[PDB]
Write a protein that binds this ligand. Structure first.
Ligand code: HEC
Ligand code: HEC
Ligand code: NI
Lengths: 106, 106
């Protein structure tokens, strides 16, 4: 899917995690976030269209998703050990990373 | 140093990074910040003084500094590599993580 679709998937599953009742629910939402981040990592954002595909700004954009995926993996590790509160807390650590990419590339 | 002093160091050295013009200064301030964060991690904050150190909240508090330290290291790598503007921008994005912890425990 394209970038706005994947961002909607990111945003909607954050709320699913916030309201989750067990760690397996958090797990399911996080795996869907993980796939959406990796799919978005293949897009070219508008504010970098007129830029070389190999530009350092393109690689910083792509590495922003690598960082986010690492944090999603960190939260998945807690969710798969049944720690619903702790994986929920880890998922809200994502929000600042969301905003840091937006500040430069949205 | 006590918790409040370490916060003073983090707050004042963020502004030092803002006004610096060369990597040597950025490195110096990021280094003071990194030690202050690791020192603050060992404290018990007043809004948690009647919890136990193994309480979730006390572990969430600790984990916030682990995460902040890693992002300081990322900015130190940029200033060791001599990219002053990028390191200054990485340091500005620390504020979101400051605020996230503050909204819970400040
Ligand atoms: C870069 C590394 C990003 C990260 C990490 C996240 N997002 Fe993002 N987001 C990014 C761009 C470039 C854009 C604009 C894309 C465009 O073509 O307009 C966005 C946009 C959003 C939006 C608005 C959706 C829309 O239809 O325009 C939302 C709601 C959004 N992003 C949410 C979001 C969340 C919750 C993130 C982390 C969990 C996140 N984004 C990360 C780039 C990047
Ligand atoms: C938790 C993981 C925190 C992180 C990360 C940061 N801060 Fe912090 N801050 C925290 C607490 C619990 C408190 C209250 C301490 C107390 O004893 O009252 C604070 C306080 C501050 C203050 C005000 C200090 C004072 O005047 O008493 C400042 C200016 C401040 N913090 C700055 C700051 C900055 C710039 C941070 C990121 C670089 C940062 N803090 C991170 C908890 C946490
Ligand atoms: Ni991070």
């Amino acid at each position: 899917a394209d970038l706005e679709d994947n961002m909607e998937t990111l945003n909607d599953n954050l709320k699913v995690i916030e309201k989750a009742d067990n760690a397996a629910q958090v797990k399911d939402a996080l795996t869907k976030m993980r796939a959406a981040a990796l799919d978005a990592q293949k897009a070219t954002p508008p504010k970098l269209e007129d830029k070389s595909p190999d530009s350092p700004e393109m690689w910083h954009f792509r590495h922003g998703f690598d960082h986010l995926v690492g944090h999603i993996d960190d939260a998945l590790k807690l969710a798969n050990e049944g720690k619903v509160k702790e994986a929920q807390a880890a998922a809200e650590q994502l929000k600042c990373h969301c905003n840091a990419c937006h500040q430069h590339y949205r």
